[PDB]
A = this chain, B = another copy of it.
Amino acid sequence: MPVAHVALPVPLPRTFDYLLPEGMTVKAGCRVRVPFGKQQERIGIVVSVSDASELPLNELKAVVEVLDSEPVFTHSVWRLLLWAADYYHHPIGDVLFHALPILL
């Protein structure tokens, strides 16, 4: 066939980069709505905010809206979760979202 989906030993937190529009401000632990595929919407959780992306600053889709003004996660809880994710080999996305419900 054509498309060979392959696995590679990727860096610890495999995340998706998105641009923050002018004037929109978000911090770690906040949920945001973002584009994805060609059709698109979905809720995500910001892990970090850098001034560098592995791809050009221009061909990055942009964040839609910020659902939280303050981290839905406790400073401690967050530290713990990022740890668990790393220590036990679990995708950050998974721990966080599967962990969100139990928290609320």
Please give the residue numbers on chain A whose beta carbons come within 8 Å of chain B beta carbons, in ascending order: 1-10, 13-20, 22, 25-26, 32, 34, 36-37, 42-54, 57, 60, 63, 89-94, 96-97
Contacts and interface: CB of A to CB of B under 8 A. Distances in A.
Given A1-B20, A14-B14, A90-B90, A6 B37 contact: no
Contact of A3 (B3, B6, B32, B49): B49
A3 B96 contact: no
A17 B6 contact: yes
A37 B95 CA distance: 27
Shortest Cβ-Cβ A-B pairs, 7 listed = A7-B93, A3-B53, A5-B15, A9-B97, A4-B49, A7-B92, A6-B44
